[PDB]
Design a protein around this ligand. Sequence first.
Ligand SMILES: Cc1ccc(-n2nc(C(C)(C)C)cc2NC(=O)NCCCNC(=O)OC(C)(C)C)cc1
Lengths: 328, 266
Amino acid sequence: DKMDYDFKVKLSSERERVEDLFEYEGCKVGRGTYGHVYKAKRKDGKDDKDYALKQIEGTGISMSACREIALLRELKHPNVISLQKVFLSHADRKVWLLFDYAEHDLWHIIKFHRASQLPRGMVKSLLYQILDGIHYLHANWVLHRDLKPANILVMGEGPERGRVKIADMGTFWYRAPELLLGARHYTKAIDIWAIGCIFAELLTSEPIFHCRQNPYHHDQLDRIFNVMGFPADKDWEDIKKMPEHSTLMKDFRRNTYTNCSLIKYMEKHKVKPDSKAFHLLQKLLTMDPIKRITSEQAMQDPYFLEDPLPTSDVFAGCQIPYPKREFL
Amino acid sequence: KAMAGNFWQSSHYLQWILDKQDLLKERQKDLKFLSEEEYWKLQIFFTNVIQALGEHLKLRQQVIATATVYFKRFYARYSLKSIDPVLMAPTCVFLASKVEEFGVVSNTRLIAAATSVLKTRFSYAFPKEFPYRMNHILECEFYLLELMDCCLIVYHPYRPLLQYVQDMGQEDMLLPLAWRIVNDTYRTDLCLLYPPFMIALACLHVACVVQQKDARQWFAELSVDMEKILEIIRVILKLYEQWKNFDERKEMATILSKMPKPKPPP
Ligand SMILES: Cc1ccc(-n2nc(C(C)(C)C)cc2NC(=O)NCCCNC(=O)OC(C)(C)C)cc1
């Protein structure tokens, strides 16, 4: 090798290995593109805390490995997911990452309600933390790029009872129209559009832009317009600058979505159009990306001064009716 | 652009701004084989090796500084015998290029880059061909990533430098020269011992003194410990005297010979 032997045996001896430190086998909680995730307690005594233990897909320090590590190694906010430790395994060269174990997420909660409405103090708290976390990420010029209920984790019983944790794991329901009109560049405003869809989803328990499945996606657009209405030139002036604009003009007619709008949609789902909640949702679900409010501005909306105030614990100190994550 | 203002809550700042006296203590290890002078000449030599590897591969100067910081940090706490610095140099470029989002440098292209630069630019130090294959780089990378405690994002002086000279309103006169002095600071321990903006101020002071431009009032108006800036000026001014007397090409084969060698297994 021509690499010092003492140095190699010292570091090898002292190196912590995931399988010595953590009990995890049989306790797989998620598959996916970016790895397999296991729910993992510790073998050695000094912990009651579960941890999400994630084996990255593949060998070596890949571009995806490198990025995920790079960022989370720096980020500290109570509403971003936290990286407790990295394990590099020299034998097989697989990279392991530890993350504090969030029992639930918004995909499972909303679904659970959709099997039988979603309590309002909770709804307003959920959004407020989602905003506080995303504002932090945006402040540090870090865009999420793929927000949706499956990526809003919520901590279970423990010292972080009911606190939203933003995460990235690996549909076009939460995508802003400009992305669908082939915008070749992610932005802060694209995230805020996605937070808009969630909020609406929370209030009603249905996805606002629910739809069956290049960057141009026709049927998904038809749904936005069926809900939102077709944008007037005045509403979004630079729609013409979007690369798939003339194709939009080819396949759609403004008149088709005449007399249908977000108020008429939310009215149907028993959300009152003169509520602070609606008036905010509207500012998130703005079609022209540069006319959406920022995350900071939304946090300052009087909706969060309206009774009841959002609580740190999303669950209001109540019993949690949602079930624990199944193994596979 | 990511994490662009997080310095004071950074892993850089909270774990990789080292105390000088701790740094020179764990250095006494290699000082039994190399003298103090020889050791800093080595540091220049590899600062220049990483530079050429950057240049050869077409890479922005920000990627080279990151690479150069990873090389310093490794040998900042470990002996020159532990891993070969000829292996560790391109490995740092390889990792930096990933961390700084320009892409993976290919197996073939990375190894040709090493092979060619030592063959071309550093023929005097290395009469045998670059020996390592890609499996080596991949192995050393893990050892490098573990040693850094996965601290990949690195702040450099070029951003604060820029912001400062734009605030002065003499960007054209000072930026070309100040930027060069900052590159030259990587020949020293400075990136391990001072926040990037300080090194930025330090360099920017020299630039103005070399260019005879008075900026006393502008400097007076800053809320920084000017004692600490004088420390960095001192070191910049000296490295240039180090440059003058150091005859890299005549000396370095002897100095690379003195390096403590790795021990292969029993
Ligand atoms: C390649 C890559 C993948 C993911 C990320 N990333 N980005 C983020 C931001 C946007 C929140 C900052 C977060 C990540 N990664 C993660 O959060 N990984 C955690 C995996 C935790 N898994 C987990 O808790 O499992 C269940 C399914 C039970 C919830 C970065 C890069």
